[PDB]
Amino acid sequence: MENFQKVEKIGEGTYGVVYKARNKLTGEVVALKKIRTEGVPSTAIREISLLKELNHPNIVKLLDVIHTENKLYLVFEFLHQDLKKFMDASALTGIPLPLIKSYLFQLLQGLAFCHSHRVLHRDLKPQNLLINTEGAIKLADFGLARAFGVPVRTYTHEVVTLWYRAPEILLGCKYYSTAVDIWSLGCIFAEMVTRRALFPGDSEIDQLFRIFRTLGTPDEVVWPGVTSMPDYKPSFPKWARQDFSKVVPPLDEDGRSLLSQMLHYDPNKRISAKAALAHPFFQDVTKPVPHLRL
Ligand SMILES: NC(=O)c1cc([N+](=O)[O-])c(Cl)cc1NCc1cncnc1
Numbered sequence: 001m002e003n004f005q006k007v008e009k010i011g012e013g014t015y016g017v018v019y020k021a022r023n024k025l026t027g028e029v030v031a032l033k034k035i036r037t038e039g040v041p042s043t044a045i046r047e048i049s050l051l052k053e054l055n056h057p058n059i060v061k062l063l064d065v066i067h068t069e070n071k072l073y074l075v076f077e078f079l080h081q082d083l084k085k086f087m088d089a090s091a092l093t094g095i096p097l098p099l100i101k102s103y104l105f106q107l108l109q110g111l112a113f114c115h116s117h118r119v120l121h122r123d124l125k126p127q128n129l130l131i132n133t134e135g136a137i138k139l140a141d142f143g144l145a146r147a148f149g150v151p152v153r154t155y156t157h158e159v160v161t162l163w164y165r166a167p168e169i170l171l172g173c174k175y176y177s178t179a180v181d182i183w184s185l186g187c188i189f190a191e192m193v194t195r196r197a198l199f200p201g202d203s204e205i206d207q208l209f210r211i212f213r214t215l216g217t218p219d220e221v222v223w224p225g226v227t228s229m230p231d232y233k234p235s236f237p238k239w240a241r242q243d244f245s246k247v248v249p250p251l252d253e254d255g256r257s258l259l260s261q262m263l264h265y266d267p268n269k270r271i272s273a274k275a276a277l278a279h280p281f282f283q284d285v286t287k288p289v290p291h292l293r294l
Pocket residue numbers: 010011013014018020030031032033060076077078079080081082130140
């Protein structure tokens with residue numbers, strides 16, 4: 001209500017329902033997300049408002065935050081498609097390496113900007129990466145997780161995807177660092193390359209064990225302090241690490257090298273977005289035009 005004309009429902013968003021809407025005034029087309037629950041903290045409104053100032057070409061612009069009678073409305077710049085749908089559509093042929101590289105490079109620029117401004121995403125996944133016809137890709141939902149501590153679910157009994165969760169979160173760490181986003185982005189990079197989710201767990205423990213089966217069960221050597229983590233159990237099975245050549249074939253050594261650094265167990269050893277941008281993998285990065293059908 002008030003200035004907005006609903007064009008259609010986009011989906012059952014993470015924090016609520018989402019509509020494509022037109023601002024009767026400006027005439028602009030936007031994504032409007034209606035947030036839960038029956039209170040809505042004033043701390044969240046302030047923190048969220050802060051995000052309106054977080055502007056970068058690879059970050060979906062938060063145009064407005066509107067608090068009104070039990071419901072928070074977030075108005076975002078609109079993009080027609082997300083990476084999850086694009087990957088499904090490119091399943092038979094695969095996304096061309098040059099485009100995978102362009103997307104990864106752009107997402108790292110976005111993360112570097114967010115992280116330098118002390119903003120974490122915390123829930124990166126293909127569905128939260130939006131793309132347009134110009135070859136741009138943008139991070140969506142940056143900072144919402146913190147302005148709400150822990151998201152948990154959507155609003156209509158939906159199965160929370162754990163596929164992109166960093167191991168420190170799964171092991172009960174209470175303090176997230178910028179490293180959790182690099183881990184999620186690494187999982188997404190692998191998925192674009194192989195056309196299959198890297199760690200498709202269907203429970204928190206299945207997610208953790210899928211990670212362990214591929215990267216090896218972590219220990220104090222590769223991850224100092226891991227055995228003192230909240231949910232770590234000495235009873236975890238001990239699996240040997242597999243070779244990356246087997247995990248993301250036929251990605252080249254530059255790609256495997258970068259991916260391995262994005263998937264280090266120790267959050268402190270995990271590569272930063274800034275450092276990743278300098279990796280030899282991006283020596284020949286370009287900005288291709290995607291084949292997008294809308
Ligand atoms: N910012 C946005 O444009 C956007 C926001 C949200 N959201 O949650 O606030 C969602 Cl779901 C999807 C979006 N767009 C991608 C899309 C658009 N139309 C049809 N399928 C996908």
